[PDB]
Structure formats: C-alpha cells, structure tokens
Design a protein around this ligand. Structure first.
Ligand SMILES: Cc1cc2nc3c(=O)[nH]c(=O)nc-3n(C[C@H](O)[C@H](O)[C@H](O)COP(=O)(O)O)c2cc1C
Ligand SMILES: Cc1cc2nc3c(=O)[nH]c(=O)nc-3n(C[C@H](O)[C@H](O)[C@H](O)COP(=O)(O)O)c2cc1C
Lengths: 223, 223
C-alpha cells in the first residue's frame, strides 16, 4: 500500500470488529512512526496504550463522570476555539450531517444522536485505546509535532490493514483519564486514538467524507 | 513507495538541486494531503506557496531583519519551550552535533554556525517555499491538525521523488514574512517548508538521524 493509497484509505472509523490487535504489530508500527520529524528533534509525544481490563477501567471511570452531566466535565483545554466562526464551524456540521445520515437517526432526534455520541467513550468498540499526551511545558509547535506523529501512526495502521479514530472527546475528562492511567499533573492529555480492525460493512464507515477545495487552502505566488 | 518506506526515507533535507518543481505535481500532492484528518474536520491549515521573484522578495525582506541582529527578531511564538529540560534538550543536542559534524562545522566555529543560520533563510537552496499559517483564533489542538497536514505533505513529496525541510526559523520573523506575503495580523505563521529536489550527493543530506527508543515513548497497560 503506497503513501498516497494509505492517505486516501485512512478515515475516522466508528465501527470496529470484535477482533484483537497483534501487539507485536503495534510495536513495529510505533517503531516506524517514531521517524516523524519534530522541531529540534524533540519528539515531544508520549503515549499510553491500553487494552483489556485497563481499557475497561478508563471507560468505567469516565462513564461515572458522563452521568454527572455538564457538572462532570473536566476540559484539558479548549477543544474548539471559543471564537470559532465560519468558514470553520460549518465544516464540523457538514461532516456531522453525513455521519448521522449514514446511520439511522433523524436530524431532530436529539435523543438518538446523543446515544451514538456516547459510543465515543467506548472507543466505538475498539479493542485498543491509545492516549497521546505530553509535558505541560510544551507549546503549540510541539503540539504540531504530536500531530505529525499521530498522522504517521494512523497512516501506518491502514497500510497494515488496521484502522483508527482520533478522539478529542477524551480531553473533556482529562484529569479522570490521567488519574486512571496513573499519569501525573506534569502531563496534559491531548487526544485518544481508538485502534482496531474496521467493520468494513458498517454504513458509518462507508459514507464519503468531505474536504474543502484547494482554493480555500492554497495560494500560489511566483509560478 | 509504500507508506512505511516513505516515512523511513523522509528526512529534513538541507541541500537542494536547481531542478524546478512541477506545479502540477505540487497541486496534485496538496489535493491528496487535504485528506489529512482534523478535529471536527475544521481543516484549519492554510498555506501560501512561493517561488520565483516572490520567493526572492521574502528572502530579501527577512535578510533585512537578519542584519539588524537581535533587534531584527519578530517571534511569532516560543519555538522551544521556555524552561526546556532533559530528556528533550539532549535529543536536540544529539541531532545538532550530527548535523554540524556532517557540514564540517566546529563548536568554536561561530562563522559556520552563522552561515548555517543564514542558509535557513534561503530555504537551503530549494526552488519553492511553502508557508503554513492559520487564523490566530486557532488553539493547540488545531496546531496538531496542521502537523497532521504537514507530515502528510512531507510524505507525499518523498513518494513523488521530491524532498523537503520543515522550518520554524521563519517564525522568528513572522511579521516580516506575513507582511511580505500580504497576510493580515489575523493570521499567525507556524512554519515554513522548503521544497525541491534533494541534492543526494550532499553530506548534510546523508548522515543517520537519531530517534529515541520506544522504551522512552510507549507505556503498555492491560496486555
Ligand atoms: C485530533 C482529532 C480528534 C478527533 N476526535 C474525534 C472525536 O472525539 N470523536 C469523533 O467522532 N471523531 C473525532 N475525530 C475525527 C474527525 O471528525 C475527522 O477526522 C474529520 O471529520 C475528517 O473525517 P475523516 O478522518 O474520517 O476523513 C478527531 C480527529 C482529530 C484529528
Ligand atoms: C515544525 C518543524 C520545524 C523545523 N524547523 C527547522 C529549522 O528551522 N531548521 C532546521 O535545520 N531544521 C528544522 N526542522 C528539522 C528538525 O530538526 C528535524 O525534523 C529533526 O532534527 C529530525 O530530523 P529529520 O527530519 O531529518 O528526520 C524542523 C522540523 C519541524 C517538525
């Protein structure tokens, strides 16, 4: 599988089969993903990978927070910018529209879409959850470094016939997640990464995901 | 070239040939790179790509700042964390020594380190410079998004027989660069990316670049 093909085939998978992930395979993928570049070769990314009973504990701990409602939230940071405007805000809901449409839940049906949302905290049934975190001394460019590493992993997973869904929803309960994992407060949780084998027949995995055109992204000067 | 191979063969290239870059190739690469994921599909990354006369104008404007010395600096942000410590600093010093050894530039050699500094602001002789920037409303997770896009770009270049060097050195003169590109102060410059055909005979492009072992990266729980 070529780099181009891996990139095309990578999507956020929100339906996984009940099927284990070979840990030896995982380690080899992390080995190669470490070749991601970073400012000053700092390699600021740290990861805690969980499965089985530990993965079950994290889910339980967060579930206990979820039923507290808005009172239970523990945001690591502002997931979205507070002053978010168009064109960006609309991009969120365009993808949202497609996702829920691909399922069998109406637009107005606020009850059912909530239910599917909570599936996030089961990692959409993935056997493995990766938690990506770093020291709180790190600034924005090191967060960009983390992104380079995370995309490397996601691409490598696809090349090896695995799949993933990156999840910032975990940062909504950062302290609970950090406490459950045994991470100290010197660390900040950025994102989770659900990892497993895709259910390739699941409709939620088959809808075409949109992107803006290059005219909204790239300016050419001097050509 | 497989995704694994692309990741392994990508390095920060600091010597380029005069061979021109097919814009048609670049544009197709960007089309694919847009498939990078982002939190909420915000796709926050923006890029202004420059070549030819406009590219030299940017160099000229920044060069005007360099001769001002420490007064010429216009930091967009802290490139390295204030209060950086080990293990990360040690990682930096490792690649630094390696890079300078390949150039034949000594510790005492203040002349060469300055020249090497100045070479950064020529994009190391690359025919095309990409400037990655975003709205100033974006937060750290959106900077991670930019990182996912940028690594996507760097891998695709390598797949197509091209090469790159990510460059935060441009952020040192952000306002000069943004002013020259015609960017407003609503935008913040993250990084440059030099793009072109690598000079593979160049020793600076040939030394083995270090990475820490997975024992410093991944914690396994529940296996
Ligand atoms: C950092 C990050 C966090 C994400 N978090 C979530 C999440 O918590 N829940 C979710 O359903 N999708 C999440 N996503 C997936 C995005 O919604 C998705 O990347 C975007 O819609 C593009 O679609 P695609 O990745 O399937 O191509 C996340 C993506 C990124 C990059
Ligand atoms: C965001 C970013 C900015 C960078 N800026 C520079 C730079 O200004 N000058 C430079 O020589 N290298 C720069 N680099 C290259 C790093 O030093 C390099 O990625 C790291 O040493 C690992 O080496 P490699 O990319 O060749 O594998 C940058 C890398 C990243 C990710």
């Amino acid at each position: 599988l070529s780099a181009s093909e891996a990139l095309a085939r990578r999507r956020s998978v929100r339906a996984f089969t009940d099927r284990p992930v070979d840990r030896a395979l995982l380690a080899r993928i992390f080995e190669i993903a470490q070749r991601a570049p970073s400012g000053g070769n700092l390699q600021p990314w740290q990861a805690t990978v969980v499965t089985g009973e530990r993965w079950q504990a994290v889910q339980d701990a967060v579930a206990a927070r979820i039923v507290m409602g808005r009172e239970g939230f523990q945001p690591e940071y502002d997931i979205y910018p507070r002053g978010l405007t168009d064109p960006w805000d609309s991009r969120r809901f365009g993808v949202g529209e497609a996702l829920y449409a691909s399922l069998g839940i109406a637009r107005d049906d606020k009850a059912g879409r909530i239910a599917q949302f909570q599936q996030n905290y089961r990692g959409f049934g993935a056997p493995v959850m990766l938690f990506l975190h770093c020291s709180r001394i790190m600034g924005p460019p090191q967060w960009a470094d983390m992104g380079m590493w995370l995309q490397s992993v996601m691409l490598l997973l696809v090349e090896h016939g695995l799949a993933s869904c990156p999840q910032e929803c975990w940062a909504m309960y950062g302290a609970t997640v950090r406490a459950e994992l045994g991470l100290g407060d010197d660390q900040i949780l950025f994102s989770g990464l659900a990892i497993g084998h895709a259910d390739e027949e699941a409709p939620v995995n088959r809808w075409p995901v949109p992107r803006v055109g290059l005219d909204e992204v790239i300016d050419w000067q001097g050509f």
